[PDB]
Write a protein that holds these residues in place. Structure first.
Motif, mmCIF file in Angstrom:
data_model
loop_
_atom_site.group_PDB
_atom_site.id
_atom_site.type_symbol
_atom_site.label_atom_id
_atom_site.label_comp_id
_atom_site.label_asym_id
_atom_site.label_seq_id
_atom_site.Cartn_x
_atom_site.Cartn_y
_atom_site.Cartn_z
ATOM 1 N N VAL A 57 0.900 -1.167 0.767
ATOM 2 C CA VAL A 57 0.214 0.609 0.552
ATOM 3 C C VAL A 57 0.724 1.819 0.213
ATOM 4 O O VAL A 57 0.174 1.962 -0.139
ATOM 5 C CB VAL A 57 -0.892 -0.157 1.035
ATOM 6 C CG1 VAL A 57 -2.471 0.607 1.121
ATOM 7 C CG2 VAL A 57 -1.601 -1.117 1.262
ATOM 8 N N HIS A 58 1.648 1.543 0.357
ATOM 9 C CA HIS A 58 3.145 2.593 0.663
ATOM 10 C C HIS A 58 4.595 1.184 0.318
ATOM 11 O O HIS A 58 4.818 0.230 0.913
ATOM 12 C CB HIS A 58 3.249 2.811 1.981
ATOM 13 C CG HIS A 58 3.172 4.293 2.261
ATOM 14 N ND1 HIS A 58 3.561 5.353 1.466
ATOM 15 C CD2 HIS A 58 4.042 4.984 3.471
ATOM 16 C CE1 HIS A 58 3.372 6.663 2.242
ATOM 17 N NE2 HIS A 58 4.417 5.911 2.952
ATOM 18 N N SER A 59 5.602 2.290 0.191
ATOM 19 C CA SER A 59 6.739 2.421 -0.242
ATOM 20 C C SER A 59 7.435 3.733 -0.399
ATOM 21 O O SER A 59 7.828 4.082 -0.592
ATOM 22 C CB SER A 59 6.698 1.197 -1.643
ATOM 23 O OG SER A 59 8.156 1.461 -1.647
ATOM 24 N N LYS A 60 8.493 3.808 0.988
ATOM 25 C CA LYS A 60 9.171 4.451 0.751
ATOM 26 C C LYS A 60 10.395 4.686 0.187
ATOM 27 O O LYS A 60 11.190 5.727 -0.356
ATOM 28 C CB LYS A 60 9.426 4.388 2.572
ATOM 29 C CG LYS A 60 9.797 6.658 3.500
ATOM 30 C CD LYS A 60 10.555 7.021 3.168
ATOM 31 C CE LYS A 60 12.310 6.488 2.549
ATOM 32 N NZ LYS A 60 13.012 6.905 1.725
ATOM 33 N N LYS A 61 10.793 2.731 -0.321
ATOM 34 C CA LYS A 61 11.591 2.458 -1.282
ATOM 35 C C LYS A 61 11.885 3.407 -2.380
ATOM 36 O O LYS A 61 12.704 3.274 -3.066
ATOM 37 C CB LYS A 61 11.593 0.926 -0.788
ATOM 38 C CG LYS A 61 13.619 0.467 -1.479
ATOM 39 C CD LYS A 61 13.700 0.346 -2.978
ATOM 40 C CE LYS A 61 14.635 0.859 -4.120
ATOM 41 N NZ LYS A 61 14.382 0.207 -4.927
ATOM 42 N N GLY A 65 7.277 8.311 -0.058
ATOM 43 C CA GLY A 65 7.622 9.147 0.868
ATOM 44 C C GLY A 65 6.708 7.970 2.434
ATOM 45 O O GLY A 65 6.789 7.074 1.919
ATOM 46 N N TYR A 66 7.257 9.413 3.547
ATOM 47 C CA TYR A 66 6.082 8.533 4.625
ATOM 48 C C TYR A 66 4.404 8.945 4.005
ATOM 49 O O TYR A 66 4.537 9.006 3.521
ATOM 50 C CB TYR A 66 6.650 8.768 6.395
ATOM 51 C CG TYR A 66 8.386 8.218 6.331
ATOM 52 C CD1 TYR A 66 8.789 7.131 7.229
ATOM 53 C CD2 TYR A 66 8.837 9.312 6.518
ATOM 54 C CE1 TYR A 66 9.723 7.208 7.033
ATOM 55 C CE2 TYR A 66 10.557 9.375 5.954
ATOM 56 C CZ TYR A 66 10.687 7.425 6.940
ATOM 57 O OH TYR A 66 11.788 7.356 7.320
ATOM 58 N N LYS A 72 -2.528 11.785 1.868
ATOM 59 C CA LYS A 72 -1.768 10.871 2.007
ATOM 60 C C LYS A 72 -1.843 9.241 3.458
ATOM 61 O O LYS A 72 -1.588 8.212 2.417
ATOM 62 C CB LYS A 72 -0.114 10.936 1.875
ATOM 63 C CG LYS A 72 0.766 9.607 0.928
ATOM 64 C CD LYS A 72 2.469 9.731 1.467
ATOM 65 C CE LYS A 72 2.785 11.023 0.989
ATOM 66 N NZ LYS A 72 4.454 10.915 1.113
ATOM 67 N N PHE A 73 -2.253 9.804 4.182
ATOM 68 C CA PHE A 73 -2.557 8.310 5.223
ATOM 69 C C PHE A 73 -4.303 8.116 5.013
ATOM 70 O O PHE A 73 -4.187 7.308 5.313
ATOM 71 C CB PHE A 73 -2.487 9.542 6.935
ATOM 72 C CG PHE A 73 -3.047 9.108 8.065
ATOM 73 C CD1 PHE A 73 -2.598 7.460 8.081
ATOM 74 C CD2 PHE A 73 -4.468 9.126 8.723
ATOM 75 C CE1 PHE A 73 -3.513 7.133 9.530
ATOM 76 C CE2 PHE A 73 -4.907 8.522 9.534
ATOM 77 C CZ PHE A 73 -4.415 7.002 10.133
ATOM 78 N N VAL A 77 -6.236 4.947 5.569
ATOM 79 C CA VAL A 77 -7.250 4.646 6.073
ATOM 80 C C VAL A 77 -8.663 4.425 5.287
ATOM 81 O O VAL A 77 -9.308 3.906 5.397
ATOM 82 C CB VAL A 77 -7.720 6.199 6.917
ATOM 83 C CG1 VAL A 77 -9.157 6.130 7.570
ATOM 84 C CG2 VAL A 77 -7.091 6.295 8.163
ATOM 85 N N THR A 78 -8.891 5.119 4.107
ATOM 86 C CA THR A 78 -9.743 4.617 2.883
ATOM 87 C C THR A 78 -9.084 3.260 2.574
ATOM 88 O O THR A 78 -10.339 2.398 2.279
ATOM 89 C CB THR A 78 -9.438 5.977 1.818
ATOM 90 O OG1 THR A 78 -10.329 6.724 2.212
ATOM 91 C CG2 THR A 78 -11.228 5.382 0.929
ATOM 92 N N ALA A 79 -8.202 2.582 2.145
ATOM 93 C CA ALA A 79 -8.608 1.826 1.254
ATOM 94 C C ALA A 79 -8.437 0.167 2.296
ATOM 95 O O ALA A 79 -9.129 0.150 2.357
ATOM 96 C CB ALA A 79 -6.805 1.321 0.828
ATOM 97 N N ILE A 80 -7.503 0.230 4.187
ATOM 98 C CA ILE A 80 -8.291 -0.370 4.766
ATOM 99 C C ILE A 80 -9.332 -0.790 5.327
ATOM 100 O O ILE A 80 -9.514 -1.973 6.061
ATOM 101 C CB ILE A 80 -7.273 -0.303 6.342
ATOM 102 C CG1 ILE A 80 -5.331 -0.384 5.506
ATOM 103 C CG2 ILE A 80 -6.736 -0.669 6.629
ATOM 104 C CD1 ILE A 80 -5.015 -1.812 5.039
#
Length: 88
Positions: A57-61, A65-66, A72-73, A77-80
């Motif tokens: 769902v996210h990739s700092k690499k 970002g965070y 971005k948060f 929240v929407t996906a989870i």
């Protein structure tokens, strides 16, 4: 079923509150319907790689970002929330 979430990370000090202010949200939002853990291998660095049920769902690499903003948060929240109402 419940749902398992993960964050793979590099323990460059400070990590507990940096985790919890996201983690202690996602569990506040979706309690007992969900899990979040963290599995921070060494040798890897500069990262924060977020997965649910084996799905990124996210990739700092990759340069995601965070969760650097509300919007971005709110992606998480929407996906989870959506992924919860499937697995429930």
């Amino acid at each position: 079923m419940a749902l398992a979430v993960r964050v793979v990370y590099s323990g460059a000090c400070g990590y507990k509150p940096k985790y919890l202010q996201l983690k202690e949200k996602l569990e506040h939002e979706f309690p007992g319907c969900l899990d979040i853990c963290g599995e921070g291998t060494p040798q890897v660095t500069g990262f924060f790689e977020v997965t649910v049920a084996g799905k990124l769902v996210h990739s700092k690499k990759r340069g995601d970002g965070y969760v650097d903003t509300e919007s971005k948060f709110r992606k998480l929240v929407t996906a989870i929330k959506a992924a919860l109402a499937q697995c429930q």
